[PDB]
Design a protein around this ligand. Structure first.
Ligand SMILES: N[C@@H](CCC(=O)O)C(=O)O
Lengths: 235, 235
């Protein structure tokens, strides 16, 4: 198998599910005591957030690209960035490090098009919803049309993420509000819904979404595994 | 803070607690949004465990020293090996990678002499319990001697580590068993018990012990945080 390089610590808690799912996918596919060949670089998030909060995305891309190049030196053969929001600087990493870059939106695009769909909705942070980096990569690589909530809903959905889901509160009222938004977007033509982080999936089980759900982080880990074994899109 | 290099995947289930506790310890000490600078090399355990089986210890030493050098090339400033057993080849790693090597025994041995004890019980793989690499280290460096369970219990203890804990079966049958073995060794004058496999902390809650507990994963991760911040023994 190929060795995967992980760019993580943003946050460390959200890195653990990449490591878990990658190892489980390898152990499922290879059998027995097989585990994943993984190189991980975990940042001090403090230093990233200081750049992000001042909008110094060039500094963040310089830090993350230097981290990728270190993994490549240690023998990684592909790069996974274990955060949606930091794909703001994916172009910095992809253009500077010659290793295949497995963009989070590309993994999801492959899943969306493998479900026969052209038109989806995206729920996440307001930043992730409103910036070009996620939805734009989907169109550029796939022609996938990506619907977002209106401005008032974006603000409510975000507030729910940072005031509740982030602090462990998965409440029915928030659950129902998301399912209502998903439903509105379904009636506008959305054929599936991308949940931009693990926690939205924690709040909204697929039973409660009227649309097929694409959990972008779990999908990302599963695509890493396909890459390491050279399967499907990576054969 | 100094970047710690972790050598893990032995098993990957036991690498996760290292990653969690190191981040947790760094955030406790630095506060705010601070997380750990960690480089991790996670191996395919199938290769390592095959070598152990075959008695090809020099080969595992080769594998692990090269992983360490690869972490050093990516920026690691200290080496932590997330496995007691593989400390049998710590000398090939410590000699070919000249980063500070935080030997798992040393931190435990510091903690044992620290409580004013000298003779303890040792639970671990059969290698870790039966052989000299580990207990010879505690003797050499601290004059500490260990009592180990009888030959039948050692076989059962080991079968539990490799068939259960490394594949993620944690059960009260196993746990309870480890509990009873402790009782016996206390009765034999053991002043404390070292959980000398990094996944006996993933099975037994500390408070079933009739002897004081020295958990090597926990102590090792604490020693990593102290080295990273140059605290306590690290100056
Ligand atoms: N958890 C065991 C791993 C044994 C092995 O690597 O075979 C230990 O710390 O030794």
């Amino acid at each position: 198998m190929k060795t995967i390089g992980l760019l993580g610590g943003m946050s460390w808690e959200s890195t653990i599910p990449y490591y878990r799912l990658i190892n489980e996918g390898i152990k499922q596919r290879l059998g027995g005591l097989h585990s994943a060949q993984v190189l991980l670089h975990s940042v001090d998030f403090h230093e990233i957030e200081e750049c992000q909060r001042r909008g110094e995305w060039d500094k963040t891309g310089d830090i993350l690209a230097e981290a990728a190049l270190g993994l490549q030196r240690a023998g990684a053969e592909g790069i996974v960035l274990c955060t949606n929001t930091m794909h703001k600087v994916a172009d910095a990493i992809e253009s500077r490090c010659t290793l295949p870059f497995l963009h989070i939106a590309d993994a999801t695009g492959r899943a969306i098009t493998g479900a026969g769909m052209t038109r989806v909705a995206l729920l996440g942070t307001r930043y992730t919803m409103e910036q070009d980096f996620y939805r734009g990569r989907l169109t550029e690589q796939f022609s996938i049309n990506c619907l977002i909530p209106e401005a008032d809903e974006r603000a409510k959905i975000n507030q729910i993420i940072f005031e509740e889901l982030c602090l462990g509160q998965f409440t029915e009222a928030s659950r129902a509000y998301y399912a209502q938004v998903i439903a509105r977007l379904a009636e506008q033509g959305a054929q599936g819904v991308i949940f931009g982080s693990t926690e939205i999936g924690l709040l909204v089980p697929e039973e409660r979404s009227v649309l097929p759900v694409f959990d972008t982080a779990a999908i990302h880990a599963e695509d890493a595994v396909a890459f390491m074994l050279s399967l499907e899109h990576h054969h």
